[PDB]
Write a protein that binds this ligand. Structure first.
Ligand SMILES: Nc1ncnc2c1ncn2[C@@H]1O[C@H](COP(=O)(O)OP(=O)(O)OP(=O)(O)O)[C@@H](O)[C@H]1O
Ligand SMILES: Nc1ncnc2c1ncn2[C@@H]1O[C@H](COP(=O)(O)OP(=O)(O)OP(=O)(O)O)[C@@H](O)[C@H]1O
Ligand SMILES: Nc1ncnc2c1ncn2[C@@H]1O[C@H](COP(=O)(O)OP(=O)(O)OP(=O)(O)O)[C@@H](O)[C@H]1O
Lengths: 530, 530, 530
């Protein structure tokens, strides 16, 4: 690659070595395990580049990582792409067969794997063909990664290549029959970092990430680049605490002891942290979790705002950066009380710098932002995957009409607030309308005798795709289908016929099929019952 | 231009229509003249695009602007580049012959000119060949720009082109025999905006620009893109106040009445504002001027910090964005008293996100950042001009060794603070060393009987390029050359022989040649005396 | 595609419409189901092209077929490639998960499927994404293919395209973790047809295919193009009988009634046909089966030659045409008695026209054709797959050293006879030598008390990869491991130490893991026991 120095390329090494701030005595902390400064972190990154080069890793190669959140994962975020290789982030919560599929599909050359994921490997290792080396990672001195790093020099000259070289890849299960692979370039990751820093860095006084913060992730580093936050923290040169495996007591201790002020997580882990007993005597009033990944419920938001936590939501997916929108509150909206707060903070948010985000219908017509007209969200941004790796027909559907299709159904306010209402697939196509299964499920779950409910589409010749319910009861709880029907038929203010209560078809089921991720399997649910 | 929607191009229209924040009721204020909201501003930008298209302006064309800071200049910053044309910003403080040269060199098609610069035009209009239309701008209803805009529609579909299309150009006098033309692309301006927003937006608590600020420029909009601040303010959607022609009373009233909180200026105007009588009864403790363009003196910095002004310096040039470095203070450095503050705040600063900035010697060897070793600053950044327009030999010297040569001589601290010490040309090459003329000039001007001094290089056969002084005395003030020599020879702690006092050669001169910009002409000074 | 008529392209349509012989009253017979002449067959091929075009099938598309051997499969062999589409032949003996994988990997647009394979589909249909139409095939009038064909015209102008356009694809399980996809072009299939017709057509008086023969396949049409024989039969214009689903009574009746004279099959089906009772009163002395796919055993060859059957073997794989070599006997070798005959006829054969076929060692050195030195067979021919579809690392290993690696271990005679001795993977790497597991297995199975044996590689620190046995006993049969050891240790004339009897390690096991194809799983066998 011959480059003229005038033609600036946006590479991840510029992110590491041309930061917003660099303090060589700031520290990276791994749990109660290890602790070292930013000068050691830079040295270790160069050593890791030396070690990878010694193993025969080249510019086009793929190195796969399977570990928890640690300093080693942070070093892989930089060293692998800076040598020109491609970081394949393995989703360890998939089943072994899916994991084997993604390793075969990506064609990894080396696998870095934690010792306590060696049992998943034991049952798929006979079928792996492309992998020449396995490096076992441990939390003590017996780590093979530490031994590899120790015998290398702290010197390395990182190459210059085109900014459009692929940097990372990971696989998303979604709604297809096999996992799909997304990928991003150096330019896209660099631009995601600066775009989000421009958006949440400039907020007047709520929900801002700045150079005085202390960062600790609580959302996996293999999911969406950990929302890109490990890159933005490094760019800001702030203290970074890595908890390892998520255990609520350990997490609460790390927050108290290392004085964490910025995190991301998902509603389940936040509920676990707040409902822990050890959390009752803890000061939380300097902490700023952003909750992405699932809809933040208003009840959880309210419970968190009474502990003085600056909780807010964000939106994104595997195909999109991940960040597309965040909730940011004006000085007047900060004057409201906890209920009007909890309403705003639970929204999907407003779109970030350099994002388009229209709501459209099935034929790609743009719907008004009136506050109630719903449609599918389609986006244009500087950091979207152009297609699925090694895939054509699914890629065409991803980018239909010149926009990226998120698969989520929402309405937008006239002031720009986005409220996701359901999924495109999950929408019931009764008669001629589209009711959301989410609101009906939420109504039914409000019952004092219900633990879970799913809503699916059964058919009808007269009203087409019509609603149906599965309900699961609690300890020694028995409420019939007809009673549930009446309870639902109570409510008012809905569409269709009357307010949609003649097709509820509620059924009580011991269990609802759930994936390995813990999300109810709507595909198998509609396979079994019909 | 055919683009696939996947391939995202970084254009200025995305800056206008994909902001960090958009409030359609936020306002743009022109002095006491006009006031309208952001919704009117977007409408006017589309109208201006319609009007330019009607005049035959095409993608490659050049529109030249000659006005003060106003809303019209802000509209030209967006409309001209968004149609694909090139905005040539005319430096109205140059002499008429230089202005004529730059108009001929750039080959402008249309000229927008304020009525009170029509006398400069009257004497160069006979020699302009390429210009087909002159639009006269006025501060009342008789403006030709307002009439052109009124008869257009508020609708316009802005094209998509390559991100490497040139957006702006302007000319810098510098050290050559004619002005040199620099140019920037859409990608470079967009990246300058996000890089600076990432740097100064994320500061913990001092010197930050955010979405709650009110912006008013006090540095010309034709100089360096006004430090890029008009783009960053628009991106943040904050209130923007344009003062027009700089008069200190009007400026102080605008600060008081519109509640301005962020500005940029140069030391002379700041001294005028602080030394005004009307400024004695004014609250200044929410104002954050950044002083670039010349070295901020410690005495001015101290006088400003006792009025509670958040004053800080920044560094950049016509060839470089303009921003390369800014002073940003840590929470501990904010605990210091006004003297240790005034020391830090007057430094050139630390480099911003995505900037390299080495100090080097004459043969391109990198000098240590020990705190006192000086050398020329050379930089790499995403927003540097690749060459001078229509120029080859000077362009080769600009990028010698694969780095951009700034022409400034500085040392860097081990913590990253840059202190500019002099110019490369102005360095005295006595014997084998390089003394700075700036420190000697500063010493000599400390005298209670001196109004100004210049230091230049006279020659010597024995000590080569040796120092020489020109001094100008005050009202009825007479101090001989020998007395000045003794006064200088007093001081201690310097290099060369003894502490360099045998070649001072001080001469008293009624005047020192000054350019139209007001900067002492070192070239003519060394032409006259030798 | 613009072609000059001078530049002749080798396309499959030339095979159909420029044959060696065309008799429009010759007939295609499907079992006891249907019967029509070659003029109807050409008309139906044009109708099928019309129907496929009406469904939106284009030049690059993929149509997948899942049926038994019938006239419809023969029509798919021509119509799909002649329109420029790609025929994906689905292996219905794979498990449903593998079938689903190959459908996803190939990205089929339409699926033609027989009604009695609809239960495999029912359990993978929820996970198929790319398929827009399913055409159900039946053996009566209710076939959807017949209905589609009836409403089309018998006219169609077939395009001219490049001869290097892909025509067919199918997937082979082999030794990797997922099935691999091979593909062939029009040129390759045409050249395979003429090369084999040149080889076996010109034989003096044994084992020749000519224009007076009657052809009936007994090896699946989805396996290797049915050894390319359906193309060669059509080219010769001979009568073609398709039996449908292989049932020995039906097959014997078809041979007797339609007077079949040329077939291909595998040893198991031939053993079933010869050992049937209905076969005892059948004249077989005009029939010429070629046995490929597995090694033809000498005992089966001898039993077939006493019924006066012209039995001979052939060699090929999914990656190679399939044909690479056939046994062809000289007039002197036809004078030998049934034992010396059965020896020659069971060999792998000699290579066919335009085939290279060297035996090599692990470092790609060419071994002598002395008659006993063994090595891996590597080939060059006009009809080999250049790589695996969507695959890089496995493709590199397929073509290592500039030759295609078959994975089989054989020695070659000085007269050119090839005798395959084992697989490359199955070779035991004891000490420094390579014994074949096949000869040891054959010895052990000779025991009067054994039903099956497998030999695998257990390890040893002293002799490296050393032999091990699994044995299964017959009805109420019990012979210990030590007795088996002694029985084996009897024999003489072998290598290593003594004659290799100290590491036999025989174990009696109720069952030996078998794949869905019925081939013993050596991979799982070495996974379980070690
Ligand atoms: N703030 C939010 N509110 C509501 N839904 C959200 C929010 N953030 C993310 N989501 C949902 O999670 C999706 C993120 O995409 P992702 O890559 O994680 O797919 P996925 O986790 O693999 O889905 P699945 O488990 O079904 O296979 C979004 O498309 C959206 O459906
Ligand atoms: N904070 C600062 N401290 C010291 N010098 C500075 C600072 N900022 C800018 N400068 C000086 O002003 C220069 C900016 O470049 P610029 O485009 O303005 O050239 P110029 O104004 O046309 O020079 P001239 O008047 O001599 O022709 C810098 O190279 C540097 O010399
Ligand atoms: N005449 C023959 N003698 C011995 N072995 C043969 C003969 N013909 C074919 N074979 C074997 O069958 C192989 C043909 O390749 P093929 O495409 O059928 O792989 P496969 O059937 O899918 O193997 P597997 O079941 O293990 O997955 C040859 O490589 C060879 O091992």
């Amino acid at each position: 690659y011959v480059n003229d120095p005038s033609n600036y390329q946006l590479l991840i090494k510029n992110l590491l070595f041309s930061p917003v701030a660099f303090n060589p005595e700031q520290e990276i902390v791994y749990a109660n395990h290890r602790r070292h400064s930013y000068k050691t972190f830079h040295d270790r990154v160069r050593q890791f580049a030396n070690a990878l080069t010694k193993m025969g890793v080249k510019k086009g190669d793929t190195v796969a990582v399977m570990d928890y959140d640690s300093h080693r994962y942070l070093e892989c975020y930089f060293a692998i792409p800076m040598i020109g290789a491609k970081l394949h982030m393995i989703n360890v919560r998939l089943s072994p067969e899916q994991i084997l599929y993604t390793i075969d599909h990506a064609e990894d050359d080396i696998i870095l794997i934690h010792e306590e994921f060696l049992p998943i490997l034991d049952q798929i290792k006979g079928r792996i063909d492309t992998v020449t080396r396995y490096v076992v990672l441990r939390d003590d001195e017996e780590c093979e990664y530490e031994r590899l790093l120790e015998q290398e020099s702290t010197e390395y000259n990182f190459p210059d290549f085109d900014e459009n070289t692929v940097a990372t890849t990971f696989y998303t299960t979604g709604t297809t029959g096999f996992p799909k692979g997304v990928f991003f370039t150096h330019r896209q990751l660099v631009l995601h970092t600066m775009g989000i820093l421009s958006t949440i860095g400039t907020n007047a006084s709520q929900g801002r990430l700045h150079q005085g913060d202390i960062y600790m992730p609580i959302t996996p580093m293999f999911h969406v680049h950990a929302w890109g936050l490990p890159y933005m923290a490094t760019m800001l040169g702030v203290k970074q605490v890595y908890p390892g495996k998520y255990v609520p007591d350990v997490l609460l201790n790390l927050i108290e002891q290392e004085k964490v002020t910025f995190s991301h997580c998902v509603p389940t882990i936040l509920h676990l942290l707040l409902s822990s007993p050890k959390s009752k005597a803890m000061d939380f009033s300097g902490w700023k979790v952003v909750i992405g990944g699932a809809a933040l419920p208003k009840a959880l938001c309210k419970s968190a705002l009474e502990r003085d936590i600056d909780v807010f939501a964000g939106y994104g997916m595997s195909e999109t950066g991940p960040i597309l929108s965040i909730v940011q509150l004006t000085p007047e909206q900060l004057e409201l009380d906890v209920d009007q707060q909890a309403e705003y903070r639970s929204k999907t948010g407003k779109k970030v710098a350099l994002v388009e985000a229209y709501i459209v219908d099935e034929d790609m017509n743009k719907l008004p932002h009136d506050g109630e007209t719903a449609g599918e969200i389609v986006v244009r941004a500087p950091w979207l995957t152009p297609n699925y790796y090694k895939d054509n027909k699914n890629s065409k559907a991803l980018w239909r009409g010149g926009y990226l299709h998120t698969g989520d159904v929402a309405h937008i306010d006239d002031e720009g607030f986005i409220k996701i209402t359901d999924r495109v697939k999950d929408m019931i196509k009764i008669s001629g309308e589209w009711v959301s299964s989410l609101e009906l499920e939420d109504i039914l779950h409000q019952h004092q005798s219900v633990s879970e409910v799913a809503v699916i589409g059964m058919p009808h010749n007269k009203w087409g795709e019509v609603p149906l319910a599965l309900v699961t009861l609690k300890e020694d709880a028995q409420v019939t289908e007809k009673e549930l029907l009446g309870f639902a038929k109570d409510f008012i203010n809905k569409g269709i016929l009357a307010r949609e209560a003649l097709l509820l078809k509620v059924k009580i089921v011991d269990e609802i099929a759930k994936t390995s991720v813990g999300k109810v399997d709507k595909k198998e649910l509609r396979k079994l019952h019909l």
